[PDB]
Amino acid sequence: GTSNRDWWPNQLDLSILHRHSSLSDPMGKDFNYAQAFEKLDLAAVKRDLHALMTTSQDWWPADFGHYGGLFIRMAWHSAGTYRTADGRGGAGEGQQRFAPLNSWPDNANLDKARRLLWPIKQKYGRAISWADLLILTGNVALESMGFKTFGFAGGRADTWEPEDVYWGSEKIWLELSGGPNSRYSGDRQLENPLAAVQMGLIYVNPEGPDGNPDPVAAARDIRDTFARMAMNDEETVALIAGGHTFGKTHGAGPASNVGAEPEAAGIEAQGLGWKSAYRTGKGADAITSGLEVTWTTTPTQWSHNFFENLFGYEWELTKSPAGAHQWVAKGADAVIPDAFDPSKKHRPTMLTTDLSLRFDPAYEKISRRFHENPEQFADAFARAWFKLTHRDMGPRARYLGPEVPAEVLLWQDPIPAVDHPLIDAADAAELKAKVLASGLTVSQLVSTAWAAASTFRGSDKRGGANGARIRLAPQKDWEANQPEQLAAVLETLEAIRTAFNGAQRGGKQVSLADLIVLAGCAGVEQAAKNAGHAVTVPFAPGRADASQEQTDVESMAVLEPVADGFRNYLKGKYRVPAEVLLVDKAQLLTLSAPEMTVLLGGLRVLGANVGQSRHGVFTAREQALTNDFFVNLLDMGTEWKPTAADADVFEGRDRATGELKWTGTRVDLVFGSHSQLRALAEVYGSADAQEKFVRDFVAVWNKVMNLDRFDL
Amino acid sequence: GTSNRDWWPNQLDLSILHRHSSLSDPMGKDFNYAQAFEKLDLAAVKRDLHALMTTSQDWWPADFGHYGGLFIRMAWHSAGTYRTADGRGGAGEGQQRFAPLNSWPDNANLDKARRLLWPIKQKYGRAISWADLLILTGNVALESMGFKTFGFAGGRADTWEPEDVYWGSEKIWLELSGGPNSRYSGDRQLENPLAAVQMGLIYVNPEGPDGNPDPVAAARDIRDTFARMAMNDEETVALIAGGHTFGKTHGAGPASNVGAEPEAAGIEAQGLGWKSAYRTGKGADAITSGLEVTWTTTPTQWSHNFFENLFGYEWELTKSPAGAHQWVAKGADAVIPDAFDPSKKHRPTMLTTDLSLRFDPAYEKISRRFHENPEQFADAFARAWFKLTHRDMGPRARYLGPEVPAEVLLWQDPIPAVDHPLIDAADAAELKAKVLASGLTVSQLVSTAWAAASTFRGSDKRGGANGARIRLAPQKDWEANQPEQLAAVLETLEAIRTAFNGAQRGGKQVSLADLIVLAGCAGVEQAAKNAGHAVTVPFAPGRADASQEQTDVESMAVLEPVADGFRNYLKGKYRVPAEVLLVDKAQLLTLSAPEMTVLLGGLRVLGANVGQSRHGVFTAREQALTNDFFVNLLDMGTEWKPTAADADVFEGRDRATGELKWTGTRVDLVFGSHSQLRALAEVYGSADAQEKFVRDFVAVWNKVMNLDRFDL
Ligand code: HEM
Ligand code: HEM
Ligand SMILES: [Cl-]
Ligand code: NA
Ligand code: NA
């Protein structure tokens, strides 16, 4: 059947805003995962997982009689899709069990790992999510083989359909770089927001860059992709050598033996894939990557044998039974045990990418330190394994269960505890009146609260107004945040705060983080009053102020809005049309198409635009909350044309007289162009819509102010 | 960006079950269109629409100074997408304003017509839908130009995104037959469920079949496509001759002047398309179809001039100014007015498809009768226009406002009024005990109530258990309904009815329609009891029994289920795989994926399979309501393979011993295979899910029993 996407392959896709509907969710609308998890007997789950580690199924026999290695790779792959650029991927939604990730070549035979866990998932039911189980299983694998983990948090709710993610433009799995859809340009520059070298890989090609078995060149791809997944040199070395302390690769015969990935397989495979015609198809005959490497003398026990082997031998380029590049120890004894035959032993082997840890000069210093000091190695690995598997879980308030680490980590963007009484309804009314009496405008108050709250992204639950980090480096200097206007608003608000907190009894006080949001609420109420409408904007106190010392300035760079349609802002020119970037921004904010529409039309007439640009400001009563944006956009008395200067900017002229009435961007005019957005704009631009516009605008304003409020 | 559809273009699409969520809907979840429409001043709207008819806009000037013809085409095209095969298309959801229909070639310049209506839509807001306004505007155009309509119902709620319709497989607009995705095979057989001859046409090609100007062969396409839109010979002639009493076609210059359709046009076109470089690009210079035909000497007034011209001249094949085939009257004077220049007159002209009404022998007799009896033409056209424009609105109980015709029409599948007290909860408990004491089994009761209720489709709101049509021709004879078993159940239930109605005083009686659904509910109660669960199934009385004379046997044939995965039924072998037909059926029943999953798992263990097939009956306690289907399907102890005889039947064998445990169809095993369906099966197959399975099943059972209950 030919679809709208076939006919008009470049039209905006709004479906990404309407995923995760009550319709697709088999749980009741009242289902609370946290409430179910908090009654889970986690100790009983961990005992079942521990017994599973050494209970081989004949449909996928356990290497060395232990599934630990397989389950560590499973949990590492669940977490390893994460990109810092947009916070998409990671383990936080259990997306490994859906398309496309369930059928990525780098996830080959993790279908077997997930099937081994069905009996335990079945036993504990809704009290443990697949998303949590995949990570827990990884932890129990490590614990069962003598490794002390840093801890574990539950709270990853299951999802019921594929995340809409840009994974790249290539039309062939594992396509080498330099093709018609190359993710590389210039001097091997990987396109944002990608964090893997090839379509269907987690980070890098274990053979080396585009198959070239050079460990030095491979090191470059390792550093670049791992930085793009929030990992520095020390963390990267600890993770790779930590993982490759356990288990083995599978390359027993030619890859051409392996059949269809799960999403392409027959219905009778019942959700499994990569069926191999090679000998038994499994166990001693398994083919996964096409490499055949076993790193250590005890693949089912924690050791420091990975670095002993890395540094204790010289390495020779060789080929797996499948014809993949890999390395073997020159002049070595057969010291490595076979996975199935207790009478066979093998020489030490390494991947190109393992030799990166010795032949990259910066990696070599860390690898030597970890070699000489295996206790430093074990602590770095434990901290990195925690960070990897929790990086997208959001604030510490979301962390459930008895194994949550007490140590607060810089990477968590921590919020101090609140140790004092909160402001009540009468206090909030008093502070709103003081804000409005200071002379701060609707535009200053709405702009500032928008700038603070709109850094939130539901992809990894980073950002939001909690913390008041808008006052700190680097947020206070982001071009979109208008740093000089921002500094003047914050100076006034901080004087209001000091005066209010000075006058209080009983330790009651208000955070700047709360006052920034409450001020924006006053601005919206004033705008409604300006329009002749009395509304109360909801407000929930309880935000706290984080310090500069509790803020990683480098990690915060990825939250800079370089495109924000709701402020008619574009830092530079991009491949991607501005209207596509607007819908991407709405998805990160968790907004529906109706919520995006009403929010943007309101923000335009409140003066939220960066630099007080007139673009899209379709009103003669700026700083009044009206549906003017919609009534004026949909007026067929106005005709629109691109400017000679700039084809991304449109003039709206009286169709009769040619008089210039308005200017607008692609972000403004898409609401009068796109057939589904124009239908929404019509509802808000109708003569009966004033009360609905104000109500809906206040609702979506309050939603944005509260995105990071997991403390509630 | 490469998507799951790009990687796996044959996988099932579940997104069609999760459209029309609260997320995409700008209205509150409490919004009731019927209540809004009931408060509309319909008189005021019609005055505004009368005024609009002759208020010409410069950007699309009115032919003859009256938009009536354009608006009649607009309304005809809104209604004209309808197919009897699945009930999809039609005017009932206002889909002409969305992709792809807003951009079909046959809908060229109807973007101008919809834009002319924006001021009226704006003025009345949510109190009149686009869907109601398109039809009402058609009605007012006819009334303006002197034709009395049969009436008008409101109540078509607006929709907020495109409907998922199979319009065909061609990848080229207007592709002629015999291409690589031909909708024709054999002796010009049109594939079900399509009801148009080319991709992007409403019914037929106005030049003739694949552009060959033979009015006799064109008549064959007209008869076939109109039949597939529920219209017989009389209705077809009345509609074509009626429509083409008004207005004109547009082909003033070559089609190459005409630019991008609306979904392809620049953002500056603000939702309009087909911008033309020919002269002024509008009015006298307009290009829409490429044909240049004006039928009557009074194109803005009801006349008898269509059939006077048709029969009154001999016709000569000629070419429009765009190169299109059309016909001119031999030796005629210039009697037809110009649309713009009072000093120009034209000879009569006709389309190939107009001449069909004269040169097809069966049409010729109707056309001659209409020519000789113009009152019979006016009455037939008025009745056909009402049917065309209301065909997909469902039972008369949905019809709103003060212009609803009182006459009950056979095509409405009418239900008699209830004129008696209904059964109460005490009566319902008595009837259920009598049903269970009769000896009717769980399997008999569930199968019968499923057969009765599951004919409903939300596409045109035809079907359902109201009317007890399962006891009439043709439903009582349908293979899927198991005619011999059905006869036996109906006889027993009619004996219980006769005895209950005979014992009543005060006129109280129960309909067979009610008793069939109540007897199904008792069957589900009994099944729950068989499984040790205490369950009440909700029931709402008030169905009535329709007569055979109130049931058009030929119209009822299109509701026959030739595929029903819920009974593991396939009537023959189709090109579409059975799991695609299952999701298609779920969409028609208005089911979500979770609802489809629970229902099918339950029906399999209750014995609802046609012919008592063992396929998918994965329980050892048939007629007990359990989640056995899920627990057994997901059991990894079982391995599945297609049979020798039949690649569409699968055997489930113990992995260890090779013993046969189960058999299943594609419809059974897709729940074990598709990654999203398997995630749902797992919820219902978990150790904590027995009660949730029972309660979810009862909810979706009652939902199906109530689908056609608009009387509530
Ligand atoms: C440059 C980064 C990495 C590369 C290129 C890489 C590559 C690979 C490859 C090709 C395999 C073999 C797959 C098979 O044939 O079964 C594998 C196995 C494995 N990897 Fe990695 N890996 C990397 C990082 C990591 C990290 C960060 C972890 C965990 C902290 C990890 C843990 C494992 C484990 C446990 C296995 C063994 C699976 C088993 O026993 O079945 N890897 N790796
Ligand atoms: C065999 C079936 C039919 C064919 C092939 C057909 C074909 C056409 C074509 C090609 C046009 C010219 C479009 C243009 O260039 O602007 C037209 C116009 C029109 N048709 Fe039909 N039509 C059919 C049936 C109907 C029916 C059922 C109705 C209404 C009951 C209808 C009412 C109209 C009217 C009112 C116009 C004039 C538009 C104007 O004045 O702007 N037609 N038709
Ligand atoms: Cl639930
Ligand atoms: Na994420
Ligand atoms: Na329909």
Neighbouring residues of B472: CB distance < 8 A, sequence distance ≥ 6: B546, B547, B548, B551
Smallest Cβ–Cβ distance between A171 and the set B2, B99, B115 belongs to B2
Region of residue B283 (left: phi > 0; alpha: psi -120 to 50; beta: else):
left
CA gap B242, B226 in Å, rounded: 15
- Helical residues (DSSP H) of B643-689, grouped into ranges: 666-669, 675-684
Point out the residue among A121, A636, A666 whose CB comes nearest to the CB of B118: A636
The CA B250 to ligand 2 mean position distance, Å, reads: 11
- Distance from C-alpha of A306 to C-alpha of A381, rounded to nearest angstrom: 13
CA angle, B159 as apex, B156 and B160 as ends, to 5°? Answer: 160
Domain count, chain B: 4
Cα(B337)–Cα(B298) distance, integer angstroms: 8
Whether residues A592 and B23 touch (CB distance < 8 A) is answered with: yes
Query: Looking at B407, B429, B450, which one is the last position of a domain?
Result: B407
Q: Are residues A14 and A101 in the same domain?
A: yes
Asked if A652 contacts A638 with a C-beta cutoff of 8 angstroms, the reply is: yes
Residues 179-208, chain B, touching A (beta carbon < 8 A): 199
**Cβ contact B26–A684 (<8 Å):** yes
Residue A545's SS3 state is strand
Q: Which residues of chain A are within 8 Å of residue B169 when distances are taken between CB atoms?
A: 1-2
Cα distances from B404 to residues A261, B396, B408, in angstroms, run: 57, 9, 10
Interface list for A 311-350 with B (CB within 8 A): none
Residue B250 CB less than 6 A away from ligand 2? yes
Structure-token pair, residue A472 = 């700190």
Whole-number Å distance, alpha carbon A459 to ligand 4 midpoint, is 4
Same domain, B366 and B438: no
Q: How far is CA A214 from CA A186, A203, A240, A325, A336, in A?
A: 20, 16, 17, 10, 25
Beta-ladder partners of B190: B184
CA of A203 to the centre of ligand 1 (A): 11
Given a contact cutoff of 8 angstroms between Cβ atoms, the answer to whether A413 and A554 are in contact is: no
**Statement to judge: residues A403 and A441 lie in one domain:** no
In chain B, helix, strand, coil percent, each to 5? 45, 10, 45
Cβ pair B676:A170 closer than 8 A: no
Q: Write the residue with the smallest CA distance to atom 13 of ligand 2.
A: B249
Please provide residue A489's backbone torsions phi and psi, each rounded to the nearest 5 degrees: -65, -45
CA distance A125 to A36: 10
Does one domain contain both B314 and B230?
yes
Residues of chain A contacting B119 with CB distance shorter than 8 Å: 636
Q: Is the preceding peptide bond at A337 cis, omega within 30 degrees of 0? A: no
Which among A124, A125, A672 has CB closest to B270? A672
> Is there a single domain that holds both residue B285 and residue B191?
yes
Structural domain that includes position A582: 565-688
Residue bearing tokens 């944002």: A192
Helix (H) or strand (E) holding B6, with range, is helix B4-7
Q: What is the rounded distance in angstroms from the CA atom of residue A707 to the CA atom of residue A584?
A: 17
Q: Is A499 on the interface with B (CB under 8 A)?
A: no
Burial track A183-215 (b if 16+ CB lie within 10 A, e otherwise) = bbeeeeebeebbbbbbbbbbbbbbbbbbeebbb
Q: Across the interface, do A125 and B687 touch by the CB < 8 Å criterion? A: yes
- Of all helices (H) and strands (E), which one includes residue B349? strand B349-350
Tell me the residue type at B626.
T
Query: For residue B103, which of A641, A12, A8, A670 has the smallest C-alpha distance?
Result: A8
3-state secondary structure of A43: helix
Please name the method used to determine this structure: X-ray
The answer on B292 and B306 residing in a single domain is: yes
Counting from 1 in the atom list of ligand 1, the atom nearest the Cα of A68 is 40
B271 touches chain A (CB under 8 A): yes
Q: Who surrounds ion ligand 3 at CB < 5 A?
A: A 27-28, 31
Based on the domain organization, do A343 and A490 belong to the same domain? Answer: no
CA distance B209 to chain A (A): 22
Q: How far is CA B147 from CA B242, B245, B301, B379, in A?
A: 10, 11, 8, 10
Instruction: State whether B268 and A642 contact (CB < 8 Å).
Output: yes
CA-based nearest residue to B404, from B394, B412, B396 = B396
> Is the CB of residue A657 less than 8 Å away from at least one CB of chain B?
no
Q: Which of A352, A372, A392 is the last residue of a domain?
A: A372
Atom 3, ligand 1: residue with shortest CA distance: A240
**Best residue of A12, A17, A24 to probe chain B, by most B CBs closer than 10 Å:** A24
CA nearest neighbour of A168 among A184, A183, A186 = A183
In A118-157, the residues whose Cβ lies within 8 Å of chain B are 118-119, 121-127
CB of residue B294 inside a 6 A radius of ligand 2:
no
CATH number of the CATH domain containing A619: 1.10.420.10
Which value, in Å, is the radius of gyration of the alpha carbons in chain B? 28
* Closest listed ligand to the CA of A142: 1
* Helices marked H in B373-409: 374-390
Annotated catalytic residue: which of A77, A304, A346, A615?
Answer: A77
Which among B267, B271, B686 has CB closest to A122? Answer: B686
Residue A340: is it exposed, middle or buried by C-beta count within 10 angstroms (0-12/13-18/19+)?
Answer: middle
Q: Residue B664 has what DSSP assignment?
A: E
Short-list A561, A565, A592, A576, CA closest to A665: A565
A579–B199 C-beta distance less than 8 A = no
CB–CB contact A262 B675 (8 Å) = yes
Q: Are B349 and B425 within one domain?
A: no
CA of B589 relative to ligand 5 center, distance in Å: 13
Residue of chain A nearest B591, judged by CA positions: A23
Burial A698-708 (b: 16+ CB within 10 A, else e): bebbbbbbbbb
Element (H, E) at A499: helix A483-502
Closest residue in B to A261 (Cα) is B8
Q: Are residues B142 and B56 in the same domain?
A: yes
Judged on CB neighbours under 10 Å (0-12, 13-18, 19+), B618 is buried
Ramachandran category for residue B186: left, alpha or beta (phi over 0 → left; psi -120 to 50 → alpha):
left
Strand extents, DSSP E, B562-635: 563-564, 569-570
- Tell me the CA distances in angstroms from B659 to B108, B637, B639, one per residue in order: 63, 11, 10
Nearest to B519 by CA among B589, B442, B424: B442
**Centroid of chain to Cα A463:** 12
- Among all chains, which residue has been given the structure tokens 């007290």? B421
Which residues have C-beta atoms less than 6 Å from ligand 1? Answer: A 63, 69-70, 72-73, 76, 203-204, 206, 222, 239-240, 242-244, 246-250, 288-289, 291, 351, 353
CB contact under 8 A, B168 and A14: no
Atom of ligand 2 nearest to the CA of B236: 27
With 0-12 / 13-18 / 19 or more C-beta atoms within 10 angstroms meaning exposed / middle / buried, residue B75 is buried
**B8 and chain A: CB distance < 8 Å anywhere?**
yes
CA-only gyration radius of chain A, Å = 28
Four-point Cα dihedral B521, B523, B527, B530, nearest 10: 120
Give the C-alpha separation, A430 to A443, whole Å.
20
Q: Which residue of A has its CA nearest to B9?
A: A264
| CA–CA gap between residue B445 and residue B529 (Å, rounded) | 15
Kindly report the nearest CA distance between residue B169 and chain A, in angstroms. Answer: 5
Residue B227 parent element (H or E): helix B215-227
CATH number of A486's domain: 1.10.520.10
Residue A154 sits in the same domain as residue A180: no
Q: Do B686 and A126 touch (CB under 8 A)?
A: yes
Atom of ligand 2 nearest to the CA of B218: 1
User: Residue A477, Cα to own-chain centre: how many angstroms?
Assistant: 24
CA distance A123 to chain B (A): 5
Instruction: Check whether residue A240 and residue A226 sit in a common domain.
Output: yes
* A653 and A621 assigned to the same domain: yes
Nearest alpha-carbon partner for B196 in B216, B217, B221, B175? B221
